[PDB]
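Replying to the earlier thread about multi-chain prediction with a worked example.

Input:
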Amino acid sequence: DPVYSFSQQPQDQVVVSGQPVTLLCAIPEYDGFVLWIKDGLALGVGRDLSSYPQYLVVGNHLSGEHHLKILRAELQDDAVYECQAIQAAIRSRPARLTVLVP
Amino acid sequence: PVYSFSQQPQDQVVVSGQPVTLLCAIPEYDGFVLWIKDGLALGVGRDLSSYPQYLVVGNHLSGEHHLKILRAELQDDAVYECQAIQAAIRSRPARLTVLVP
Ligand code: NA
Ligand code: NA
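Result:
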C-alpha cells in the first residue's frame, strides 16, 4: 500500500463570510511536496501560495502539518478542497466548504 | 486570465509500449505548470522525478510544457490535464486510451 497515510484530513465545514477557517492536513514522516487543490486547481506548492493573498499554509511542518488557512472567508471560497502529496502519490478526502453570507 | 494556452492536450489512442506526447504550451508564462493525472499532480514544472516514465519536454523558451510518456502501459490509461498555478488556468482534459496486445 502507499508507504504514507494521512494522520489528519480536511472535513466539510459551514462557515460565515468574513470568518477565518483552517482545513487540516497532516502526513507523518513525509518530506515531499504537498499541494492544496480548490475545485481541481492547485493553489501553490508547499508553503508558497503567494498567488493567493487569501490563502496560507500553516501548522507545524515538523509535525507533518500542511493546514490550509482561509484568512477571511468570502463566497468565492465556497468550494471543494483537497490535500495531496506528490512523492507519496496520495490524495485526501475532498472537503466542501460552505460559505454563508450575512 | 491575462494568460491562455496556445496548445492543449488532445485525446489519444496508443498501444502499450509506445511513447506518447501530450501537448501543452502557454506563451510568455514564467510561473509553475503542473501535469495532473486522474486528479493527482505528477510533479512541479520539469521535476517529475517521482515518475521515471513521465518527462516534461518541449521548448521552455516558447512556453512549452509537453508531457512525454516514454513507454505507455495500461496504468497510463487515464485523464490528463495541464494547469498553471500563477495564471490560474486549467487545460482541457485529455483522455489517453492505451490498447494492449
Ligand atoms: Na497566500
Ligand atoms: Na520523470
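The interface with chain B takes residues 32-33, 35, 37, 40-45, 51, 84, 86-87, 89, 91 of chain A (CB under 8 Å).

Feel free to reuse this layout for your own posts.
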